[PDB]
Amino acid sequence: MAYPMQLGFQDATSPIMEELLHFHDHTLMIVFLISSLVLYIISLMLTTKLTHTSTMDAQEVETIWTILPAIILILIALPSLRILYMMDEINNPSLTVKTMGHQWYWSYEYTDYEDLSFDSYMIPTSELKPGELRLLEVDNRVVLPMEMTIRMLVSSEDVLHSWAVPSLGLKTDAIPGRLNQTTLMSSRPGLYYGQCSEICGSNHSFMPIVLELVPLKYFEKWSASML
Amino acid sequence: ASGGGVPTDEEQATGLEREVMLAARKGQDPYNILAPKATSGTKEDPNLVPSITNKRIVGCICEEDNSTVIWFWLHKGEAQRCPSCGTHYKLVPH
Amino acid sequence: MFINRWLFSTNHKDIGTLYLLFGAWAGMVGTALSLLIRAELGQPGTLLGDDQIYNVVVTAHAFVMIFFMVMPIMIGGFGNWLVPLMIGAPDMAFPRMNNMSFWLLPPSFLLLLASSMVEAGAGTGWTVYPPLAGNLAHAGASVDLTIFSLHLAGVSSILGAINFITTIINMKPPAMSQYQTPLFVWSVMITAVLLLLSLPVLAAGITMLLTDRNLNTTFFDPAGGGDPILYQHLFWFFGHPEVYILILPGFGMISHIVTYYSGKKEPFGYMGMVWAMMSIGFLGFIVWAHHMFTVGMDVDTRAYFTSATMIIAIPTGVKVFSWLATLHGGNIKWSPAMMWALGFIFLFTVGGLTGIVLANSSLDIVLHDTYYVVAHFHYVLSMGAVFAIMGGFVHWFPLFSGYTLNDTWAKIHFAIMFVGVNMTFFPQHFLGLSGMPRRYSDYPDAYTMWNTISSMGSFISLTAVMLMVFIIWEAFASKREVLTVDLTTTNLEWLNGCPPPYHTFEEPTYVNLK
Amino acid sequence: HYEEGPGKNIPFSVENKWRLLAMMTLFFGSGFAAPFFIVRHQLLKK
Amino acid sequence: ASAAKGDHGGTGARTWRFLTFGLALPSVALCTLNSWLHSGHRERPAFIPYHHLRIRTKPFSWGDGNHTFFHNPRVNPLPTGYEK
Amino acid sequence: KIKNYQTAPFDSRFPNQNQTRNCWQNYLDFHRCEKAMTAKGGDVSVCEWYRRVYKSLCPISWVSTWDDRRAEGTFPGKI
Amino acid sequence: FENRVAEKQKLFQEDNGLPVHLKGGATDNILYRVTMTLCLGGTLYSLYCLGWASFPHK
Amino acid sequence: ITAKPAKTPTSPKEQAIGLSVTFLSFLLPAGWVLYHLDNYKKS
Amino acid sequence: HQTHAYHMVNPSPWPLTGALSALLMTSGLTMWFHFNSMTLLMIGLTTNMLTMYQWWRDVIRESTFQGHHTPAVQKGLRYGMILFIISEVLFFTGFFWAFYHSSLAPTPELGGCWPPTGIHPLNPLEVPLLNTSVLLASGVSITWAHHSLMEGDRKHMLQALFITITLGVYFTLLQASEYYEAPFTISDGVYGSTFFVATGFHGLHVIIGSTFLIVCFFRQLKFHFTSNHHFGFEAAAWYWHFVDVVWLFLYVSIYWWGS
Ligand code: HEA
Ligand code: HEA
Ligand SMILES: CCCCC/C=C\C/C=C\C/C=C\C/C=C\CCCC(=O)O[C@H](COC(=O)CCCCCCCCCCCCCCCCC)COP(=O)(O)OCCN
Ligand SMILES: CCCCCC/C=C\CCCCCCCCCC(=O)O[C@H](COC(=O)CCCCCCCCCCCCCCC)COP(=O)(O)OC[C@@H](O)CO
Ligand SMILES: CCCCCCCCCCO[C@@H]1O[C@H](CO)[C@@H](O[C@H]2O[C@H](CO)[C@@H](O)[C@H](O)[C@H]2O)[C@H](O)[C@H]1O
Ligand SMILES: C[C@H](CCC(=O)O)[C@H]1CC[C@H]2[C@@H]3[C@H](O)C[C@@H]4C[C@H](O)CC[C@]4(C)[C@H]3C[C@H](O)[C@]12C
Ligand SMILES: C[C@H](CCC(=O)O)[C@H]1CC[C@H]2[C@@H]3[C@H](O)C[C@@H]4C[C@H](O)CC[C@]4(C)[C@H]3C[C@H](O)[C@]12C
Ligand code: CUA
Ligand SMILES: [O-][O-]
Ligand SMILES: [Cu+2]
Ligand SMILES: [Mg+2]
Ligand code: NA
Ligand code: NA
Ligand SMILES: [Zn+2]
């Protein structure tokens, strides 16, 4: 989850999210460098009483400041697209889970074997147990096996929603009539939080997502008990 | 087939359209449709700038293909020079 | 006479003045809505109500700022005032149709205000996506009034685009080629081409939403074989060109301001600037699905849209470097308009660069529908389009009015606004990277510090807006009349005096061919 | 014809700066006030 | 293509009148014959209350709310089937 | 033939993020197979793979609506 | 039909200071008044309708 | 630019009045609405 | 007095009455869709027609009767009309995109096929082919009208323009009959939606274009056009060819390929 005064991304919980962190570090360095260069050059242009107001020939220097940005863009696009196609690669999941968005909560279906499904609603602020997080906890968490490739399928039974979990690098829109797929793999046990990420009406801010990542044998027994 | 009955512009153009038409036929351009062609622009052979008043704005494209046009009021009297290239212009009021 | 002049106008200057007044009033509305947003978010918990009232405010904020403040001021206001003067033309090509472009806007605005007064308002986002905006989740008249508001604004701008393109192509001095017209005129021509091509597609999409809502069509409804995502394509096919429409006249005014207060007779690299604006205009039509990287599109389509979007940095970079090269060697005049333009160059660059971050579809999965997007577009809109509007307003106010502003007050105003907008939006990058979603009325507790700071920033910007009104009042109250303006040889719009006569260029300029 | 010159090419009078202050106050104030009163209207509906 | 016709020399009123009466209106006449010749009602198919057809998410703003604007009782079933 | 089914495998026909048609096709295939069998006398057991795949992939409400429409005679796919 | 454009040209070029939308004669003023009355009255009526629609009606 | 001295100079006191009136025209009506928000919500 | 060739237009009320008619039509549609009343809408349609009539009347006064359409002014009007047609093309492009989006990827609700289960399309070789021949023929006859006008031939201009209008009317009547006879409706899912909204806006443009041709017919009867100056006729002909080309795209896309 996010923590107070956080500046950057939530710590990565999945290898893909780790890849995104390093790619963001690379891109932000370039962003910093170019912004700072432009600010510096502005100050340089403005700090001399020397003048030169006659016509200036442009041809030579426009080569520099076309070719240099083109090279920089290529230096961004290459790692960007590598991660894109990595995130797309075939992986062979062990488990498929569906989630359906609704106004205003998520339901989950685990129907590889038995017909397991339940609804997952925000815990009202007045009912939080001590130490629980305002607007983030749910009554029924999305229990999942850690260290395993999971296929998430996402849809909606009413308006648009979007199913997100920032620390896993996931955001898949929930569209009625459409079954969108993403894959999820947590390197660690724990609790990982997300929030509805497409405006969906009166309680858009109040339909969060909580994944609970545990060893397979715990997930199996939990699954059985949820039937 | 064939036959007539459609008026011509000669017959039926009126107002400013007709003035422009009749002037063009005489080779004249009172409504500034054409670009004037430059003289050599010396003080001896200044560009001659018609006006219906005693001043008119000139735009000077000093060199072929300059994208910057140099604009100034030209007043009745002694020829004036473009402030960028010095080419001469003289107002001819009428 | 008053009605003939101000309701029946066929005069490009008076119609420009009408647009500037309309846009200034809209700007107050838009500012009030922005303060309601930030009041709701300025402490954790709920201030106004749930997300419906909150997102009616957000939705109206955006529509007002875009369609009633920026476009009327830049295109209807500076465009009508300056384009005919900068080409020596005696008015617009269609001076009477021009007046209808203006008068469609108060009705368009009335329809938007009606949408927020009836039922529970249109709490849809300015993108108006179905099915939230459809007749089950937004039953009643509010969304239809919003659609009709957009229809009228769209007709206004399409007819205005026809007027500007025709005027700029057809009414220059016969010796003046397109490569002898000023960059602001180019910027308006290209913006008008974008308006002409993109707004009809928006009109098509929102008409389909209207019939899905009222005539039982199902363009966007899966039950009939429709698709919500089709709406998104049609909307963003307009909506990406629209953001270039919002900035291009700003680029044009920045070129004139930087050139003027550098003491230069011309911008650096004129044909490069023309090339860059045309390139940006063209590339702005082939990138729209970067608004759709999380909807489930195939990976090769995501790779194409990532790459095509990033290319626009190259022509845009040529413009930024050319503005810097215009400053180079200048006799710099530190006027208030120059300060707006310098702040523009830097802060626009920052927002353009976070836009390049977002163009990466892999990273956009995590940034999409978060405040990192909000930060990107307010750097280019609140510190780009708005800074160009303020710079142009302070630079050309003496031309339009015949009176001078107090330059010390105008610099104070710039200083306050600069602090305010940066305090508002810079922390929103942190909120975005750390996962705060868009269109939320309240947030998990961890996000409190940057939301508090951001809201405090928005109040500083409010103080700047109030001070702007006083500064305009003080100028009209004191009546310091303009005498001499420098550099008229390369700023033709000043050469008829301040204010110019009702009719200018009754006798056209003399320009020979040589 | 129409009046020309500073203070005459506008639809509002600048002949008295205090009347002008009132007019500008009503003009910009009404635009800034409107969203607050629409919010109130929506709150007092339900 | 050059189509298969032939003239020019001058494209003029006479040529376009020739095309109007010699090609365009004869083609309209032929298609009019073809059409008013294949008219004659088709059998209306069995009514099936498919959920993607006869959509009603809001009543129409005319009539009883349930009839389309150019409703033809012979061939346009209502959501509950053919009327009367 | 033997089981050990865990979940639906990658299917090269549906390699992209939109999996709507994968659910639909396997639903059709199951019910087509099942109709074929219950006729000629044979065993719906041969249809089982399609049944497992569509149950894995398809939202419960989609299956339920499609089942209701088949019973109603309003299912628009060909079975 | 005979060509009466010349007499229309005389009428609409008469030096009488009238704007083109009124220069045909009294019929222009009547049609103008009808149009503007419908527009302004209809606009007031639309504002009444907004007033009506802005509030809940049992 | 050069300009004439003000035709109708606006003294510092006059500017203080114009600035005060301008700020109050924005702040009072919104302040009234926000002060009475609870009144609105409760109702 | 001016010494350029452009037109300074007298101050005019029609921009304002046009803008207000737009307010009345849109608020009128809202009232019709949500408050069961046609009143505002009928006022808006009436003031809209009044505005268009008086505005274009004044343009005729300014040109035929006052002589303000110099060649430079006409050239601007040519660009204006071309740009207007371009915006109309892009408007139709949105509906063609909707049609191809839905028909190339038919969803499960349709049966996963195009045309959808339960849709029985019109035969494109019957009335739709007839309407194609009708608009193509009208494109030939309007070209004859244009050449007759340029050659100074009043009678054959009028004959050809009358034939063009008659064909426009024939198309509209055929299309109205086919709308009544069609066994599917606008509420028949995305097939009906795309079919009727796209051909419906096309039919509206045929009516607009026919009205514009009729205006030209009566102006021609009153001798307004000269053999060299007749931009209103040229504009109506360009608009008419645009309506014909949109029909050809609809016929190939929706009636034929989409059947
Ligand atoms: C004035 C308005 C404006 C402008 C000009 C832009 C310009 C750009 N925008 Fe922006 N954008 C918006 C307004 C604008 N945007 C809005 C409103 C939204 C949100 C819509 C909504 O959902 O409501 C948005 C959303 C948006 C998204 C969607 C993100 C999401 O929703 O998840 C993306 C993604 O690619 C994007 C990218 C860019 C890019 C690459 C540019 C480029 O044009 C920027 C190019 C400029 C530079 C790069 C800086 C100058 C260049 C140099 C100094 C050269 C060297 C630089 C490099 C080598 C990189 N924008
Ligand atoms: C031009 C566009 C523009 C501008 C200028 C602004 C300016 C501001 N915006 Fe907004 N905003 C949007 C367009 C804009 N915004 C859009 C498109 C959205 C997305 C909507 C959606 O999600 O659907 C958005 C969303 C948005 C949000 C996110 C809401 C959410 O996700 O829940 C927030 C929150 O802080 C915000 C705040 C502000 C603030 C505090 C300002 C302030 O900086 C404003 C300060 C005041 C000014 C800048 C004055 C403006 C007036 C003039 C310039 C008149 C000048 C007068 C003369 C020239 C005479 N905006
Ligand atoms: C040649 C013969 C036909 C000619 C054209 C006839 C009508 C054209 C009218 C306008 C067309 C514009 C689109 C309106 C949308 C739908 C009309 C589609 C064409 C049509 O007429 O569709 C009819 C339905 O009309 C209906 O719903 C309701 C029809 C009336 C309601 C119109 C609602 C207003 C539409 C809003 C317009 C917004 C425009 C914005 C433009 C902005 C541009 C910048 C089909 O009838 P049916 O009974 O369903 O099926 C036949 C069964 N036997
Ligand atoms: C949901 C319902 C929404 C309804 C919204 C409706 C809103 C608008 C109400 C429209 C009222 C229109 C009244 C007639 C306007 C005629 C304009 C015209 O004809 O303008 C002409 C120029 O535009 C030209 O040519 C070429 C351009 C002609 C455009 C004609 C009008 C188009 C109006 C609709 C545009 C829709 C765009 C659709 C495509 C997306 C002439 O220009 P003027 O400056 O007048 O004169 C110049 C003088 O020299 C002439 O002698
Ligand atoms: C986001 C934009 C708004 C920014 C913040 C505005 C700053 C507010 C300025 C003051 O506004 C006033 O505040 C008073 C309180 O100080 C209110 O008086 C209220 O409270 C008083 C004191 O309790 C009573 O005397 C009054 O009757 C009662 O109306 C008064 O109505 C309101 O106009
Ligand atoms: C040829 C054309 C106009 C030159 C003129 O007639 O004045 C110029 C103007 C801007 C130029 C372009 C811009 O300077 C940007 C690019 C700069 C690179 O150095 C070459 C390609 C590049 C894309 C240039 C190609 C070409 O020289 C352009 C397109
Ligand atoms: C996004 C749009 C489909 C819109 C729709 O669903 O209605 C589609 C239609 C044609 C597509 C393009 C064409 O298929 C051509 C290219 C194919 C490449 O594999 C991706 C880029 C590529 C340039 C495509 C991008 C995108 O998928 C496009 C533009
Ligand atoms: Cu569900 Cu937002
Ligand atoms: O839109 O960027
Ligand atoms: Cu974009
Ligand atoms: Mg989203
Ligand atoms: Na809050
Ligand atoms: Na011709
Ligand atoms: Zn020179």
Mark out chain E residues that contact chain I at CB-CB < 8 A: 11-13, 15-17, 19-20, 23-25, 27-28, 30-32, 34-35, 38-39, 42, 44-45, 48, 50-56, 61, 68-72, 75-76
Q: Report which ligand 8 atom has the smallest distance to the Cα of A102.
A: 1
Beta-carbon separation of B12 and G6 below 8 A: yes
Three-state DSSP state, C149: helix
Could you tell me which residues of B are annotated as the binding site? 60, 62, 82, 85
Query: Does residue C166 contact residue C196 with C-beta atoms inside 8 Å?
Result: no
Q: Cβ contacts of residue E71 below 8 Å, gap of 6+?
A: E63, I185
Note the ligand closest to the C-alpha atom of C290: 1
Residues I106 and I143 in one domain: yes
Distance from CA of A178 to the nearest CA of I (A): 9
CB contact at 8 A, F39 and A161: no
Q: Does I177 touch chain A (CB under 8 A)?
A: no
User: How far is residue A158's CA from residue H40's CA, in Å, rounded to a whole number?
Assistant: 31
Written out in words, the top-level CATH class of the domain with range A2-91 is: mainly alpha
DSSP assignment of E20-38, as one string?
Answer: IIIIIHHHHHHHHHHHHHH
> Is I181 in a helix, a strand, or coil?
helix
In the sheet that B55-60 helps form, which strands lie side by side, from edge to edge?
Answer: B70-75, B55-60, C510-511
Identify whether residues I28 and I105 lie together within a single domain: no
User: Which of C26, C120, C479 lies at the smallest CB-CB distance from D42?
Assistant: C120
Q: How many CB atoms lie within 10 A of CB D13?
A: 12
> Which residue among the candidates C319, C395, C413, C429 is catalytic per the annotation?
C319
Taking an 8 Å cut-off on Cβ atoms, the answer to whether G56 and D45 are in contact is yes
User: What are the C-alpha distances in Å from B46 to residues A175, B41, B68, B81, F48?
Assistant: 74, 4, 21, 9, 98
In angstroms, the CA I39 to CA I28 distance is 7
> Do residues E26 and F50 lie in contact, with contact meaning Cβ atoms separated by under 8 Å?
no
Q: Does C407 touch chain H (CB under 8 A)?
A: no
Rounded Cα gap, residues C476 and C494, in angstroms: 20
State the DSSP string of C313-327. HHHHHHHHHHHHHHH
Convert chain A into a string of H (helix), E (strand) and C (coil): CCCCCCCCCCCCCCHHHHHHHHHHHHHHHHHHHHHHHHHHHHHHHCCCCCCCCCCCCCHHHHHHHHHHHHHHHHHHHHHHHHHHHHHHCCCCCCEEEEEEEECCEEEEEECCCCCEEEEECECCHHHCCCCCCCCCCECCCEEEECCCCEEEEEEECCCCEEEEEHHHCEEEEECCCCCEEEEECCCCCEEEEECCCCCCCCCHHHCCEEEEEECHHHHHHHHHHCC
The set of protein residues with a Cβ atom below 6 angstroms from ligand 8 is A 101, 104, 161, 196, 198-200, 204, 207
Q: What CATH number should be reported for the domain whose range is A92-227?
A: 2.60.40.420
C160 alpha carbon – ligand 11 mean position (Å): 32
CA distance E50 to I188: 10
Neighbours of E, requiring at least 3 CB pairs below 8 Å, are C, F, I
Of all protein residues, the one whose alpha carbon is nearest to atom 2 of ligand 8 is: A204
Single out the residue in I13, I34, I68 at which a domain terminates.
I68
Token pair 């597609």: residue: C201
Task: Name the residue range of residue I2's domain.
Answer: 1-68
Show Cβ contacts of residue G12 under 8 Å, excluding neighbours closer than 6 positions: G20, G23, G24, I61, I65, I66
Question: Which of C61, C213, C395, C429 is flagged as catalytic?
Answer: C61
Q: Which of residues I68, I95, I114 is at a domain's end?
A: I68
Are C145 and C213 within 8 A, CB to CB?
A: no
Tokens 């995305």 — which residue? I190
List the Cα angle H31/H36/H41 in 5-degree steps. 130
User: Rounded to whole angstroms, what are the CA distances from A13 to A97, A195, C366?
Assistant: 19, 16, 13
Euclidean distance between the first and the last CA atom of chain A, given in angstroms as a whole number: 29
- Is residue G16 within 8 angstroms of chain C, CB to CB? no
- Residues of chain A positioned with their CB less than 8 A from the CB of F58: 179
The size of chain B, in residues, is 94
Run of H or E residues at C35: helix C12-41
| Domain layout of chain B by residue ranges | 1-94
Among A212, A209, A206, smallest CA distance to A135 is for A206
Q: How many other CB atoms are found less than 10 A from the CB of residue E2?
A: 5
Token pair recorded at residue B63: 């060199």
DSSP state at residue E67: S
Please name the residues in contact with C269: beta carbons below 8 A apart, sequence gap of 6 or more.
A58, A62, C318, C322, C325
Ligand 5: which residue has its CA nearest to atom 11? H31
Q: State whether I126 and I199 are in the same domain.
A: yes
CB of G50 within 8 Å of any CB in chain C? yes
Tell me: cis bond preceding F76? Omega within 30 of 0 counts: no
Nearest ligand to the CA atom of C316: 1
Active site residue C291: yes
Q: Which of I94, I101, I138, I112 is nearest to I237 (CA)?
A: I138
Q: How many residues does chain E have?
A: 84
Domain ranges within chain E, ordered by starting residue: 1-84
- What's the CA-to-centroid distance between A104 and ligand 8, angstroms? 7
Residues in the 5 Å CB sphere of ion ligand 13: I 234
Would you say B47 and B38 are in contact if contact means Cβ atoms under 8 Å apart? yes
Measured by CA distance, the residue closest to atom 2 of ligand 9 is C240
User: G43 — contact with chain B (CB < 8 Å)?
Assistant: no
Nearest to I169 by CA among I127, I210, I214, I216: I210
Cα separation, A122 vs A103, in Å, equals 12
Annotated binding site of B for Zn(2+): 60, 62, 82, 85
CA–CA dist C88, B32 (Å, integer): 12
Q: To test ligand 5's pocket by mutation, which of H25, H33, H35, H38 has the most ligand atoms within 8 angstroms of CB? A: H35
Annotated binding residue A102: no
Touch criterion met for A and H (3+ Cβ pairs within 8 Å): no
Residues I153, I211 within the same domain: yes
Cα–Cα distance for residue pair F26/F14, rounded to 1 Å: 11
Q: Does B4 touch chain G (CB under 8 A)?
A: no
DSSP C117-138: HSTT---STTTT-TTTTSTTTT
- My answer on whether I156 and I189 are in the same domain is yes
Structure tokens at H3: 């300009």
Query: What is the rounded (10 degree) CA torsion for C151, C152, C157, C158?
Result: 60
Pairing of strands B47-51, A209-214: unpaired
- What is the number of alpha carbons within 13 Å of residue I250 lying toward its C-beta? 25
Residue A161 annotated in ligand binding:
yes
Q: Which residues of G39-51 are buried (b: 16+ CB within 10 A; e: fewer)?
A: beebbebbeebbe
Q: Which two tokens stand for residue I136?
A: 């193509």
Q: CA C479 → CA C16, C392, H10, distances in Å?
A: 21, 20, 9
Please tell me the distance from the alpha carbon of residue C89 to that of residue C83, in angstroms, as a whole number.
8
- Pairing label, strands A150-156, A95-102: parallel
C29, C459, C465, best to mutate for ligand 5 pocket (most atoms within 8 Å of CB): C459
**Cα angle value C194/C198/C199 (rounded, 5°):** 110
**Number of domains comprising chain I:** 2
Beta carbons of C296 and C224 less than 8 angstroms apart: no
Nearest CA in chain D to C502: D4
Closest-CA residue to B23 (of I5, G14, I227)? I5
For residue A161, the ligand 8 atom closest to its alpha carbon is: 1
Identify which of C291, C300, C301, C307 to mutate to test ligand 7's pocket (most ligand atoms within 8 A of the CB). C301
Whether the CB-CB separation of I70 and B20 falls below 8 Å is answered with yes
Mark out the alpha helices in chain H (DSSP H runs).
Answer: 12-35, 37-42
Number of continuous H segments (helices) and E segments (strands) in chain E: 2, 0
Judged by a CB distance cut-off of 8 A, whether residue I38 touches chain G is no
**What part of I 109-128 touches A (C-beta under 8 Å)?**
109
Task: Give the determination technique.
Answer: X-ray
Catalytic residue (choose from C240, C264, C395, C413): C240
Q: Name the residue among C64, C235, C222, C91 with its Cα closest to residue C153.
A: C64
Q: What separation in angstroms does the CA of C427 have from each of C23, C242, C430, C456? A: 29, 26, 5, 11
Full 3-state SS string of C69-106: HHHHHHHHHHHHHHHHHHCCCCCCCCHHHHHHHHHCHH
C450 is catalytic: no
Closest-approach residue (CA) in chain B for G1: B5
Q: Would you call H22 and D24 a contact, using CB atoms and an 8 Å cutoff?
A: yes
Decide: G and H in contact? Rule: 3+ Cβ pairs under 8 Å: no
> What residues are paired with A180 via a beta bridge?
A154, F18
How far is residue I187's CA from residue I69's CA, in Å, rounded to a whole number?
A: 48
In total, chain D counts a number of residues equal to 46
Tokens of I84: 């207007």
State the resolution, in angstroms: 1.8
Contacts of I28 in chain G (CB under 8 A): 46
Q: By C-alpha distance, which of A45, D11, H18, D10 is closest to C409?
A: H18
Q: Measured in Å, how far apart are chain F's first and last C-alpha atoms?
A: 24
C379 is catalytic: no
